[PDB]
mmCIF file of all heavy atoms in Angstrom:
data_model
loop_
_atom_site.group_PDB
_atom_site.id
_atom_site.type_symbol
_atom_site.label_atom_id
_atom_site.label_comp_id
_atom_site.label_asym_id
_atom_site.label_seq_id
_atom_site.Cartn_x
_atom_site.Cartn_y
_atom_site.Cartn_z
ATOM 1 N N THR A 325 -25.118 -14.006 -8.152
ATOM 2 C CA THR A 325 -24.242 -12.954 -7.662
ATOM 3 C C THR A 325 -23.531 -13.423 -6.402
ATOM 4 O O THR A 325 -24.086 -14.177 -5.599
ATOM 5 C CB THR A 325 -25.036 -11.673 -7.377
ATOM 6 O OG1 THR A 325 -25.728 -11.262 -8.564
ATOM 7 C CG2 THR A 325 -24.121 -10.554 -6.924
ATOM 8 N N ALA A 326 -22.288 -12.969 -6.240
ATOM 9 C CA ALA A 326 -21.504 -13.301 -5.059
ATOM 10 C C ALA A 326 -20.398 -12.271 -4.901
ATOM 11 O O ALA A 326 -19.611 -12.061 -5.828
ATOM 12 C CB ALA A 326 -20.910 -14.708 -5.164
ATOM 13 N N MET A 327 -20.343 -11.643 -3.729
ATOM 14 C CA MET A 327 -19.329 -10.653 -3.392
ATOM 15 C C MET A 327 -18.335 -11.288 -2.432
ATOM 16 O O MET A 327 -18.731 -11.837 -1.398
ATOM 17 C CB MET A 327 -19.969 -9.411 -2.760
ATOM 18 C CG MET A 327 -19.002 -8.487 -2.019
ATOM 19 S SD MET A 327 -19.472 -6.746 -2.095
ATOM 20 C CE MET A 327 -21.120 -6.792 -1.396
ATOM 21 N N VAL A 328 -17.052 -11.208 -2.774
ATOM 22 C CA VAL A 328 -15.968 -11.751 -1.962
ATOM 23 C C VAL A 328 -15.229 -10.584 -1.324
ATOM 24 O O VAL A 328 -14.926 -9.590 -1.994
ATOM 25 C CB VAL A 328 -15.021 -12.634 -2.795
ATOM 26 C CG1 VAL A 328 -15.815 -13.666 -3.573
ATOM 27 C CG2 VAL A 328 -14.168 -11.803 -3.741
ATOM 28 N N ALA A 329 -14.966 -10.695 -0.023
ATOM 29 C CA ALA A 329 -14.337 -9.641 0.758
ATOM 30 C C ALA A 329 -13.107 -10.189 1.467
ATOM 31 O O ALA A 329 -13.149 -11.275 2.052
ATOM 32 C CB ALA A 329 -15.313 -9.057 1.782
ATOM 33 N N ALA A 330 -12.021 -9.423 1.420
ATOM 34 C CA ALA A 330 -10.754 -9.794 2.028
ATOM 35 C C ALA A 330 -10.539 -8.987 3.300
ATOM 36 O O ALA A 330 -10.881 -7.801 3.357
ATOM 37 C CB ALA A 330 -9.594 -9.557 1.056
ATOM 38 N N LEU A 331 -10.124 -9.616 4.409
ATOM 39 C CA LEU A 331 -9.967 -8.921 5.704
ATOM 40 C C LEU A 331 -8.566 -9.122 6.244
ATOM 41 O O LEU A 331 -8.367 -10.144 6.886
ATOM 42 C CB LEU A 331 -10.902 -9.565 6.705
ATOM 43 C CG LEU A 331 -12.300 -9.942 6.244
ATOM 44 C CD1 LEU A 331 -13.173 -10.159 7.466
ATOM 45 C CD2 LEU A 331 -12.898 -8.861 5.370
ATOM 46 N N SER A 332 -7.667 -8.156 6.075
ATOM 47 C CA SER A 332 -6.260 -8.254 6.552
ATOM 48 C C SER A 332 -6.203 -8.790 7.977
ATOM 49 O O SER A 332 -7.219 -8.694 8.672
ATOM 50 C CB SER A 332 -5.578 -6.936 6.485
ATOM 51 O OG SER A 332 -4.677 -6.776 7.564
ATOM 52 N N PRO A 333 -5.065 -9.333 8.455
ATOM 53 C CA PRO A 333 -5.010 -9.960 9.771
ATOM 54 C C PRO A 333 -4.253 -9.264 10.901
ATOM 55 O O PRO A 333 -4.125 -9.867 11.938
ATOM 56 C CB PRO A 333 -4.060 -11.091 9.427
ATOM 57 C CG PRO A 333 -3.011 -10.426 8.579
ATOM 58 C CD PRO A 333 -3.796 -9.446 7.736
ATOM 59 N N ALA A 334 -3.766 -8.048 10.682
ATOM 60 C CA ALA A 334 -2.919 -7.388 11.699
ATOM 61 C C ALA A 334 -3.764 -6.834 12.842
ATOM 62 O O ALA A 334 -4.983 -7.084 12.841
ATOM 63 C CB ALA A 334 -2.117 -6.292 11.052
ATOM 64 N N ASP A 335 -3.127 -6.132 13.786
ATOM 65 C CA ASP A 335 -3.850 -5.483 14.906
ATOM 66 C C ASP A 335 -3.819 -3.985 14.644
ATOM 67 O O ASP A 335 -4.504 -3.243 15.364
ATOM 68 C CB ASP A 335 -3.181 -5.817 16.235
ATOM 69 C CG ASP A 335 -1.672 -5.650 16.225
ATOM 70 O OD1 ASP A 335 -1.077 -5.795 15.147
ATOM 71 O OD2 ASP A 335 -1.108 -5.371 17.300
ATOM 72 N N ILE A 336 -3.037 -3.567 13.660
ATOM 73 C CA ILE A 336 -2.909 -2.162 13.269
ATOM 74 C C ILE A 336 -4.013 -1.742 12.308
ATOM 75 O O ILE A 336 -4.442 -0.582 12.314
ATOM 76 C CB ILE A 336 -1.508 -1.904 12.665
ATOM 77 C CG1 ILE A 336 -1.229 -2.824 11.464
ATOM 78 C CG2 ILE A 336 -0.436 -2.105 13.726
ATOM 79 C CD1 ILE A 336 0.001 -2.450 10.679
ATOM 80 N N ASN A 337 -4.500 -2.669 11.481
ATOM 81 C CA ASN A 337 -5.540 -2.388 10.504
ATOM 82 C C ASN A 337 -6.939 -2.659 11.048
ATOM 83 O O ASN A 337 -7.857 -2.921 10.262
ATOM 84 C CB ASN A 337 -5.302 -3.211 9.236
ATOM 85 C CG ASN A 337 -4.063 -2.778 8.483
ATOM 86 O OD1 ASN A 337 -3.504 -1.713 8.741
ATOM 87 N ND2 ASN A 337 -3.634 -3.601 7.534
ATOM 88 N N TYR A 338 -7.121 -2.601 12.372
ATOM 89 C CA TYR A 338 -8.436 -2.854 12.953
ATOM 90 C C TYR A 338 -9.489 -1.935 12.348
ATOM 91 O O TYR A 338 -10.549 -2.393 11.902
ATOM 92 C CB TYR A 338 -8.384 -2.677 14.471
ATOM 93 C CG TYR A 338 -9.747 -2.671 15.123
ATOM 94 C CD1 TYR A 338 -10.423 -3.855 15.370
ATOM 95 C CD2 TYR A 338 -10.356 -1.483 15.497
ATOM 96 C CE1 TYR A 338 -11.669 -3.854 15.963
ATOM 97 C CE2 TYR A 338 -11.602 -1.473 16.090
ATOM 98 C CZ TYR A 338 -12.253 -2.663 16.322
ATOM 99 O OH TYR A 338 -13.492 -2.665 16.915
ATOM 100 N N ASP A 339 -9.182 -0.637 12.272
ATOM 101 C CA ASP A 339 -10.121 0.327 11.709
ATOM 102 C C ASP A 339 -10.482 -0.012 10.270
ATOM 103 O O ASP A 339 -11.597 0.282 9.828
ATOM 104 C CB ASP A 339 -9.537 1.737 11.787
ATOM 105 C CG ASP A 339 -9.671 2.347 13.167
ATOM 106 O OD1 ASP A 339 -10.785 2.310 13.729
ATOM 107 O OD2 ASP A 339 -8.664 2.871 13.687
ATOM 108 N N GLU A 340 -9.564 -0.631 9.526
ATOM 109 C CA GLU A 340 -9.933 -1.148 8.215
ATOM 110 C C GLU A 340 -10.908 -2.306 8.360
ATOM 111 O O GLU A 340 -12.043 -2.249 7.868
ATOM 112 C CB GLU A 340 -8.692 -1.614 7.452
ATOM 113 C CG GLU A 340 -7.636 -0.563 7.176
ATOM 114 C CD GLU A 340 -7.702 -0.050 5.758
ATOM 115 O OE1 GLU A 340 -8.799 0.344 5.317
ATOM 116 O OE2 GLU A 340 -6.649 -0.030 5.089
ATOM 117 N N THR A 341 -10.492 -3.341 9.099
ATOM 118 C CA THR A 341 -11.131 -4.650 8.999
ATOM 119 C C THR A 341 -12.595 -4.580 9.395
ATOM 120 O O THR A 341 -13.469 -5.032 8.645
ATOM 121 C CB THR A 341 -10.387 -5.659 9.871
ATOM 122 O OG1 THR A 341 -9.036 -5.782 9.409
ATOM 123 C CG2 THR A 341 -11.064 -7.024 9.818
ATOM 124 N N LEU A 342 -12.879 -3.966 10.547
ATOM 125 C CA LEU A 342 -14.253 -3.832 11.022
ATOM 126 C C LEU A 342 -15.136 -3.191 9.961
ATOM 127 O O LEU A 342 -16.221 -3.699 9.652
ATOM 128 C CB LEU A 342 -14.264 -3.017 12.319
ATOM 129 C CG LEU A 342 -15.553 -2.825 13.132
ATOM 130 C CD1 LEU A 342 -16.396 -1.665 12.619
ATOM 131 C CD2 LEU A 342 -16.390 -4.097 13.183
ATOM 132 N N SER A 343 -14.638 -2.122 9.328
ATOM 133 C CA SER A 343 -15.423 -1.445 8.304
ATOM 134 C C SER A 343 -15.768 -2.397 7.171
ATOM 135 O O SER A 343 -16.918 -2.435 6.714
ATOM 136 C CB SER A 343 -14.665 -0.231 7.772
ATOM 137 O OG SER A 343 -14.561 0.778 8.762
ATOM 138 N N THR A 344 -14.801 -3.217 6.749
ATOM 139 C CA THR A 344 -15.063 -4.184 5.690
ATOM 140 C C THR A 344 -16.184 -5.128 6.097
ATOM 141 O O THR A 344 -17.115 -5.372 5.317
ATOM 142 C CB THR A 344 -13.786 -4.960 5.355
ATOM 143 O OG1 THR A 344 -12.878 -4.104 4.655
ATOM 144 C CG2 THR A 344 -14.091 -6.175 4.481
ATOM 145 N N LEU A 345 -16.149 -5.618 7.342
ATOM 146 C CA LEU A 345 -17.225 -6.486 7.804
ATOM 147 C C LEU A 345 -18.556 -5.753 7.753
ATOM 148 O O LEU A 345 -19.569 -6.323 7.328
ATOM 149 C CB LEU A 345 -16.945 -6.990 9.223
ATOM 150 C CG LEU A 345 -15.925 -8.107 9.520
ATOM 151 C CD1 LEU A 345 -16.002 -9.279 8.551
ATOM 152 C CD2 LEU A 345 -14.508 -7.595 9.559
ATOM 153 N N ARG A 346 -18.560 -4.471 8.123
ATOM 154 C CA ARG A 346 -19.800 -3.709 8.083
ATOM 155 C C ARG A 346 -20.326 -3.585 6.664
ATOM 156 O O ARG A 346 -21.544 -3.542 6.460
ATOM 157 C CB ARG A 346 -19.592 -2.329 8.702
ATOM 158 C CG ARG A 346 -19.336 -2.374 10.195
ATOM 159 C CD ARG A 346 -19.384 -0.988 10.816
ATOM 160 N NE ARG A 346 -19.500 -1.033 12.270
ATOM 161 C CZ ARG A 346 -20.580 -1.424 12.932
ATOM 162 N NH1 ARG A 346 -21.684 -1.803 12.306
ATOM 163 N NH2 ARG A 346 -20.556 -1.432 14.261
ATOM 164 N N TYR A 347 -19.436 -3.538 5.670
ATOM 165 C CA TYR A 347 -19.911 -3.551 4.294
ATOM 166 C C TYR A 347 -20.347 -4.943 3.873
ATOM 167 O O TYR A 347 -21.275 -5.081 3.070
ATOM 168 C CB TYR A 347 -18.838 -3.030 3.340
ATOM 169 C CG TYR A 347 -19.357 -2.837 1.935
ATOM 170 C CD1 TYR A 347 -20.211 -1.789 1.629
ATOM 171 C CD2 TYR A 347 -19.001 -3.707 0.917
ATOM 172 C CE1 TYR A 347 -20.693 -1.612 0.352
ATOM 173 C CE2 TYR A 347 -19.478 -3.536 -0.366
ATOM 174 C CZ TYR A 347 -20.323 -2.487 -0.642
ATOM 175 O OH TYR A 347 -20.802 -2.309 -1.920
ATOM 176 N N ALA A 348 -19.697 -5.983 4.402
ATOM 177 C CA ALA A 348 -20.110 -7.339 4.073
ATOM 178 C C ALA A 348 -21.383 -7.727 4.813
ATOM 179 O O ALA A 348 -22.081 -8.657 4.396
ATOM 180 C CB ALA A 348 -18.983 -8.318 4.389
ATOM 181 N N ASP A 349 -21.701 -7.032 5.910
ATOM 182 C CA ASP A 349 -22.944 -7.307 6.622
ATOM 183 C C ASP A 349 -24.158 -6.984 5.760
ATOM 184 O O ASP A 349 -25.226 -7.575 5.947
ATOM 185 C CB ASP A 349 -22.986 -6.509 7.926
ATOM 186 C CG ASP A 349 -23.918 -7.117 8.958
ATOM 187 O OD1 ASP A 349 -24.941 -7.717 8.571
ATOM 188 O OD2 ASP A 349 -23.626 -6.992 10.166
#
Side-chain angles (χ1 to χ4, degrees):
Chain A
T325 303
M327 164 148 57
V328 309
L331 319 197
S332 145
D335 47 332
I336 57 169
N337 292 346
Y338 169 80
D339 281 311
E340 300 259 51
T341 299
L342 186 275
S343 292
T344 288
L345 284 317
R346 292 190 165 290
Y347 188 73
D349 203 328

